[PDB]
Design a binder for this molecule. Structure first.
Ligand SMILES: Cc1cc(/C=C/C#N)cc(C)c1Nc1ccnc(Nc2ccc(C#N)cc2)n1
Ligand SMILES: Cc1c(CO)cnn1-c1ccc(F)cc1
Ligand SMILES: Cc1c(CO)cnn1-c1ccc(F)cc1
Ligand SMILES: [Mg+2]
Lengths: 556, 412
């Protein structure tokens, strides 16, 4: 006997106040019972389960599932109830590596750890909660009672405990062999390196020797698995990666469910294929959510789909990360609140691509969206590469400078350079800091009846220009904007506007270039045509000249 | 030896808080720091049976080549029981803000000498993430009192009093205040002499068996405030008067007797914004009466220790920021303005982060607690960048303002 190191058990508890499962065993056909008896007899010989006395109060139901085509049964213990009562664990399998952050490897070998997969010991005090019963034939004897000595498949704690146990075993090997990488997925270990293939093979044997210390055997006959690997929806190759094949179906009719799966495919593709756009296709899913409902595609959605098909015409691959080189991120504006980006090190070789969509809100502008896109790419890049890429942005340095210095919020974007690739992001209007000498002054106001929704909007000016428009289906807030629109419409290229509307000021001070409100949009269109606009606020009803006058006119 | 029993609040489980993304250089710094801490027995590796997490990062202090580990215990602190245990409470010294020099020392390293209660340790769990999650995150928990945890100064307090006993007796005029990992030491002495006493205090701690060498020099006696002031002009445009009336209207919420009637009647008729309006007698008197009102403090302003402090900040442009600290609206406990530089001439977010830290410091000195901030920034912008500029060992609460305040005008 060669002494082996025991794998240390993880102490496990039920959630506070909760007891273990007690769940009736379903009746089973005599056929299924005999198969379970045989299966458990073998499992018991291997030390995986043990027969227990009558004193154990707990139970979890056991099933016999027939493999398709097979004459051979499989045992299924349904742990759903125990899992509800089991404590939460630290789950390390969240945070999957992104292929774009991986490093190129000369060789990647796969080892089968399945022997260990079913061999990790379960905490002795917790074992009783895993009790199950094979029903006796004819119900004429007590059922055969077992409990698990090892991590049960399907139990809540098995994946985390297996991963942590394997990690602890592998740790000294990884640490003392910096020239390889080791990754654990299910019952396989993947080992890559840049070593000469002989040396690489040596490291593999050494790893096999190291695992033997715990008595974990890796099969002599080695793995069928080779690069390329199909993993988590990707294809990993030694020098490149991509997403698994993306094929968009042909249809004369589309439903909620199909458009959902279409967008999901497009979203997945967008991390490699540049320029993917989901806006119009996503819009078809607005509200609704009756899954089998057939939605007519808009012309816009058809156009977007056709554009995506062309992008997806032939395979595209990303390269891996070279830590000795800068990361560059480039962004383009696609329209309709859509942004797209590429991250690369060498020109014309992308590590990855991606997209960003405008957040839903009443009002927005291109500069804010660009800023948001930058912060998203930054965060993603910290996750994947641990550093911020240098940005190439379709906005001039002078434009950015004017924006951030005058914007009411603190705002920042990290090191970046202008790339001239239309459409460029620009400031469509900027309001004056001081009243304009020689420009006509418009005092505006509006008011609406809360019940009838009847209202008025208008202005009076220092030149005696005046207007009041009667309105229907309007609100006080809307009339305040309506009045500002009239002042813009009727004035020359330079204008001073005085309003009492905090609402209107709040919107305009937010500097939107686009809005869900048609009124705000037409106001923006007017602002764009002016040379100079000064907007002044005064409090309402204070006796302020020209504000008093127009307030009276519009109050009916 | 003999840990103080610690528990969470009734009905509360431990913090589970996601670790945010860390740069390569921060991960590397944390790996080195934690390797040593583990060797010194301060922290221990933990298993999967510990679900809890608190975020960690690292900062580089002003004038230092070395990283400092910073755990963000904000969630754990909310969930931890308050401490009445031996001590009823520390009445906050009111004289601290009256000293001519207050030096801030990082004393947090002393906490590591006290073992943490065995059953509470799991709640201190934290993770060092790996780049691109290529290797499992390194999981630790504290075996001793962690820096940044509110229970630490509470539990260490008996030891600290003992350590500082000969210094207090030798120096009765010195005001020493402890907040989290910071020790605030005031004096009215000449600064060279002040600095000597500080180093004198340092040795007391050092000889006890030890970032202590540092100090942060404040002068709270010179801290100013921003009363409401009105322009003094020889000629007023229509625009000037409208701004004045607007400002006074706003002020009249804060102050009882403000009147705009006579000033507003200067605006009679509809006039060009740039036209100069001479002031009438009635308007001039009214303006004078308003000026006098504004030289008095605000009525019914009082600090309530049972209520949160709220801090609002406005960006005034050209590296200028104004702020107000209050409990109830329009009753300001403090107002202020920073024309302060500290680099960041091209970076708004660095400036804001520095402002947040300076305001929090002021709040600690004056009331002995941190304010909840209302920050004029988008959440995503703040969260992406703030940890790059953070130099403090504590962190305050914050929320985000997405609608431009009209009142920015009048603190300007
Ligand atoms: C995450 C990961 C998944 C698999 C495999 C998962 C599966 N199935 C295999 C390995 C070795 C790793 N870990 C790492 C770590 C650093 N660089 C790399 N680069 C790298 C990995 C695979 C190929 C290939 N072919 C090329 C380069 N892999
Ligand atoms: C989400 C967050 C916080 C939480 O306030 C602090 N830093 N971060 C963060 C850190 C790195 C990033 F890239 C993006 C965000
Ligand atoms: C131009 C517009 C919209 C759409 O832009 C909504 N209301 N109004 C409007 C209608 C009449 C007005 F006098 C002023 C504004
Ligand atoms: Mg009105």
């Amino acid at each position: 006997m060669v002494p082996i190191s025991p794998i240390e058990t993880v102490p496990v508890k039920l959630k506070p106040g909760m007891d273990g499962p007690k769940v009736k065993q379903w009746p089973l056909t005599e056929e299924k019972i005999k198969a379970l008896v045989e299966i458990c007899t073998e499992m018991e010989k291997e030390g995986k389960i043990s027969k227990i006395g009558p004193e154990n109060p707990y139970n979890t139901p056991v099933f016999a599932i027939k493999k398709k085509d097979s004459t051979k049964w499989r045992k299924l213990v349904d742990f759903r109830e125990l899992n509800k009562r089991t404590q939460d664990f630290w789950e390390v399998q969240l945070g999957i590596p992104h292929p774009a952050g991986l490093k190129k490897k000369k060789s990647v070998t796969v080892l089968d750890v399945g022997d260990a997969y079913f061999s990790v010991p379960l905490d002795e005090d917790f074992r009783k909660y895993t009790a199950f019963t094979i029903p006796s034939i004819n119900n004429e004897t007590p059922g055969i009672r077992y409990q698990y000595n090892v991590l049960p498949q399907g139990w809540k704690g098995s994946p985390a405990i297996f991963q942590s146990s394997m990690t602890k075993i592998l740790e000294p090997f990884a640490a003392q062999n910096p020239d390889i990488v080791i990754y654990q997925y299910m019952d396989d270990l993947y080992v890559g390196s840049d070593l000469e293939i002989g040396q690489h093979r040596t490291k593999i044997e050494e790893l096999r020797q190291h695992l033997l210390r715990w008595g974990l055997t890796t099969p002599d006959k080695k793995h069928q698995k080779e690069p390329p690997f199909l993993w988590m929806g990707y294809e990993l190759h030694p020098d490149k990666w991509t997403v698994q094949p993306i094929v968009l179906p042909e249809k004369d009719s589309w439903t909620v469910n199909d458009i959902q799966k279409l967008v999901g495919k497009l979203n997945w593709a967008s991390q490699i294929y540049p320029g993917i756009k989901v806006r119009q296709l996503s819009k078809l899913l607005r509200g609704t959510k009756a899954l089998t409902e057939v939605i007519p595609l808009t012309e816009e959605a058809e156009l977007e789909l056709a554009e995506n098909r062309e992008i997806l015409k032939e395979p595209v691959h990303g390269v891996y990360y070279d830590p000795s080189k800068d990361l560059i991120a480039e962004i383009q504006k696609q329209g309709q609140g859509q942004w797209t980006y590429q991250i690369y090190q060498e020109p014309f070789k992308n590590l990855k691509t991606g997209k960003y969509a405008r957040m839903r809100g009443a009002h927005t502008n291109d500069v804010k969206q660009l800023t948001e896109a930058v912060q998203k790419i930054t965060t993603e890049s910290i996750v994947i590469w641990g550093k911020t890429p240098k940005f190439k942005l379709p906005i001039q340095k002078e434009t950015w400078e004017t924006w951030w210095t005058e914007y009411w919020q603190a705002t920042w974007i990290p090191e970046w350079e202008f790339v001239n690739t239309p459409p460029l992001v620009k400031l469509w209007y900027q309001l004056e800091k001081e009243p304009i000498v020689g420009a006509e002054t418009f005092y505006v106001d509006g008011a609406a009846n809360r019940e009838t929704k009847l209202g008025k909007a208008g202005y009076v000016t220092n030149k005696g220009r005046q207007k009041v428009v009667p309105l229907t289906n309007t609100t006080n807030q809307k009339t305040e904007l309506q009045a500002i629109y009239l002042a813009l419409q009727d004035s020359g290229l330079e204008v001073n506007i005085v309003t009492d509307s905090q609402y209107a000021l709040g919107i305009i001070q937010a500097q939107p270039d686009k809005s869900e409100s048609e009124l705000v949009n037409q106001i923006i269109e007017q602002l764009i045509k002016k040379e100079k606009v000064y907007l002044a606020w005064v409090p309402a009803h204070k006796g302020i000249g020209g504000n008093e006058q127009v307030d009276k006119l519009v109050s009916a | 030896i003999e840990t103080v029993p610690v528990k969470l609040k009734p009905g509360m489980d431990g913090p589970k808080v996601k670790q945010w993304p860390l740069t390569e250089e921060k991960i590397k710094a944390l790996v080195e720091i934690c390797t040593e801490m583990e060797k010194e027995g301060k922290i221990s590796k933990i298993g999967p049976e510990n679900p809890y997490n608190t975020p960690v990062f690292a900062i580089k202090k002003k004038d230092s080549t070395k990283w400092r580990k910073l755990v963000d215990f904000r969630e754990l602190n909310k969930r931890t029981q308050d401490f009445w245990e031996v001590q009823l409470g520390i009445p906050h010294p009111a004289g601290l803000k009256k000293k001519k020099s207050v030096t801030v020392l990082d004393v947090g390293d002393a906490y590591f000498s006290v073992p943490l209660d065995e059953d509470f340790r799991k709640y201190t769990a934290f993770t060092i993430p790996s780049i691109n999650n290529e290797t499992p995150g390194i999981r630790y928990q504290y075996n001793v009192l962690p820096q940044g945890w509110k229970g630490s100064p509470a539990i260490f307090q008996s030891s600290m009093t003992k350590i500082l006993e000969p210094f207090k007796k030798q120096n009765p005029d010195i005001v020493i205040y402890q907040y989290m990992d910071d020790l605030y030491v005031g004096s009215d002495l000449e600064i060279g002499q002040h600095r000597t006493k500080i180093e004198e205090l340092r040795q007391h701690l050092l000889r006890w068996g030890l970032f202590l060498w540092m100090g942060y020099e404040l002068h709270p006696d010179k801290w100013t405030v921003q009363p409401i002031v009105l322009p003094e002009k020889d000629s007023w445009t229509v625009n000037d008067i409208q701004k004045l009336v607007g400002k006074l209207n706003w002020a009249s919420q804060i102050y009882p007797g403000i009147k705009v009637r006579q000033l507003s009647k200067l605006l009679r008729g509809t006039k060009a914004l740039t036209e100069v309006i001479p002031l009438t007698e009635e308007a001039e008197l009214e303006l004078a009466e308003n000026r006098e009102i504004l030289k008095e403090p605000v009525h019914g302003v009082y600090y309530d220790p049972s209520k949160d402090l709220i801090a609002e900040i406005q960006k005034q442009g050209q590296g200028q920021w104004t702020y107000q600290i209050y409990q109830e609206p329009f009753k300001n406990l403090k107002t202020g303005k920073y024309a302060r530089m500290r680099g960041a001439h091209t970076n708004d977010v660095k400036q804001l982060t520095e402002a947040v830290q300076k305001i929090t410091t002021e709040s600690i000195v004056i009331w002995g607690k941190t304010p909840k901030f209302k920050l004029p920034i988008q959440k995503e912008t703040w969260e992406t960048w703030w940890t790059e500029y953070w130099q403090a060992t504590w962190i305050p609460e914050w929320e985000f303002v997405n609608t431009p305040p009209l009142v920015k005008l009048w603190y300007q």
